[PDB]
Design a protein around this nucleic acid. Structure first.
Length: 547
RNA sequence: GGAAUUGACGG
């Protein structure tokens, strides 16, 4: 990071802040003002050495904790102290992250001053002016380019890191338009007009669009260019506009279709190109190849998903015609292509819906065979973290497969039935385990849909789950299953009495648990004790309401 | 009162 010199803290300064963070995440505060007073206390010892605290791996975390938990005056004080060295920080391994926090808080505060009126608006504008000669540099920089991305979001009232948007004064809008065109001008060696750009500077721009750090910045600009440029200069920098293939564009499109970064870029950008330009790329370069591309799970499949969302009725149907006969084979690796087709089929009024269900079942629960078990097919239950002495935590593919199963259960009743049968085919032993599993407990919970599961299947699930009433009651996850059971147990009151009895026998264990005492409420167990007839009455009112 | 290394780039 030669872009500025910050130096380092000494062991004395290190230990003070190393200790402030300790006692700050300890969160042993006995009031809010006490915790605030401690933050102010930190900001205080931090004055004059802010550039050092923010560029250290030991204390940069601390600084954004501070940026989030501090005053709006103090926030303006911290921002003001980064004056003159914003580019340096922007390009810095640790500081670039703090500038990001700083800027999101700042953006929130800028709205409060817009909707309830040195102001934060002017402060932001100062730093912006300070970065403008460096934007093209920043775009390619492995740290700075994230700050440039964020800035463009804020300036366009798009949504920010860590699902909220913020409104902006007109100057922010004017600044955005200024820096888009500054980049555009600085990407075209001049120039006269669209019609006067060399096929070598078009190639050089295309080259940026598949760069691992420049590409998201170019996606973003294309995403927000439409706000002023009703001609969309940057799109037209990348793709052509005539009804025929161009050998350079074609060679380029094939690379996008086979390259991870270029796949992202094509898919993120189709979601914001004008339909006429997207239909052109489809018909020219993909239409007659749609299955071959669909089979490219890591590159290009994703472009097919984007076509399915942003093309119009007639054409997403053609793609569905091509791809649904292939779906079960495509699910062998790329499960998320399943979601794109389910969603697309629904968007077109259940188009080919029966065939999609046929295919899903063909893959995850093929009628013909034995050992049919959608928990093995779809979650790979046997080769999973489920039930280890090895002290492993649930994985991200586990969470991903679980969510896919759940959406399958939402999709149709056939799948709800299939996984219930699959759960009963398990050894009791193993179904119980899933209830204690951070990720898989959600799958059990998802099955407990009273009006949707016939009373015989309910009763048999209840034969298993009931054995563990108390244990489920006191478990982080099992307690969420036990709550669902209050309703599931409708028209089956023998199982209600049996469960409520079990919980009550072990009352002091059940209460005096964080989770147990909530189950106690949800099952109205206090009524079960004080006023049985009133408890029974609730049961009857439940059965009537649900049936 | 609970789910985490997604197909690209950062502690």
């Amino acid at each position: 990071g030669p872009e500025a010199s910050f130096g380092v803290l000494d062991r004395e300064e290190l230990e003070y802040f190393k200790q402030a963070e300790s006692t700050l995440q300890l969160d042993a505060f006995e009031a809010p003002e006490e915790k605030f007073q401690f933050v102010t206390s930190i900001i205080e010892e931090a004055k004059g050495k802010e550039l050092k605290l923010v560029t250290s791996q030991i204390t940069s975390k601390l600084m954004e904790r501070v940026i989030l938990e501090c005053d709006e005056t103090q926030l303006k004080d911290i921002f003001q102290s980064f004056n003159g060295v914003f580019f340096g920080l922007s390009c810095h391994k640790y500081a670039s992250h703090v500038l990001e926090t700083l800027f999101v808080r700042s953006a929130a505060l800028v709205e409060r001053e817009l909707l309830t009126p040195v102001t934060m608006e002017n402060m932001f504008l100062f730093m912006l002016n300070e970065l403008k000669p460096h934007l093209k540099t920043m775009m390619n920089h492995q740290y700075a380019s994230h700050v440039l991305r964020l800035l463009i979001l804020i300036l366009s009232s798009k949504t920010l890191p860590n699902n909220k948007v913020y409104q902006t004064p007109e100057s922010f809008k004017s600044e955005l338009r200024d820096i888009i065109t500054t980049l555009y001008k600085g990407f075209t060696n001049g120039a006269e007009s669209r019609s006067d750009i060399s096929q070598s500077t078009i190639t050089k721009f295309r080259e940026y669009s598949v760069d691992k750090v420049a590409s998201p910045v170019i996606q973003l600009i294309i995403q927000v260019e439409g706000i002023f440029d009703r001609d969309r200069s940057f799109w037209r920098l990348v793709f052509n506009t005539a009804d025929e293939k161009d050998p350079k564009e074609e060679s380029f499109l094939e690379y996008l279709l086979s390259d991870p970064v270029g796949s992202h870029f094509l898919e993120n950008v189709i979601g914001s190109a004008r339909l006429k330009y997207v239909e052109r790329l489809y018909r020219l370069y993909m239409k007659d190849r749609i299955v071959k591309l669909a089979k490219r799970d890591t590159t290009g499949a994703f472009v097919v998903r984007a076509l399915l969302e942003h093309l119009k009725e007639k054409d997403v149907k053609q793609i569905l015609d091509a791809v649904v006969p292939e779906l079960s084979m495509l699910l062998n690796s790329n499960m998320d292509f399943g979601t794109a087709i389910i969603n697309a089929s629904n968007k077109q009024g259940g188009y080919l819906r029966d065939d999609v269900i046929a295919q899903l079942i063909q893959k995850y629960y093929p009628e013909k065979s034995d050992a049919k078990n959608i928990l093995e097919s779809c979650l790979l239950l046997s080769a999973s973290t489920l039930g280890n002495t090895r002290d492993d935590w649930p994985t991200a593919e586990e969470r991903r497969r679980s969510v896919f199963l759940e959406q399958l259960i939402d999709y149709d009743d056939k799948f709800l039935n299939i996984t219930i049968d699959s759960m009963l085919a398990l050894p009791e032993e193993r179904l119980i385990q899933m209830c204690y599993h951070g990720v898989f407990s959600h799958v059990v919970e998802h099955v407990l849909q009273t009006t949707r599961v016939d009373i015989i299947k309910r009763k048999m699930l209840l034969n298993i789950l009931s054995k563990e009433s108390v244990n489920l009651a006191c478990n982080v996850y099992g307690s969420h299953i036990m709550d669902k059971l209050w309703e599931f147990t409708a028209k089956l009151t023998l199982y209600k009495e049996r469960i409520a009895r079990a919980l009550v026998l072990e009352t002091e264990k059940v209460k005096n648990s964080i989770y147990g005492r909530q189950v106690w409420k949800n099952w109205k167990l206090e009524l079960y004790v004080r006023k049985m007839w009133d408890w029974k009455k609730l049961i009857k009112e439940q059965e009537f309401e649900i049936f």
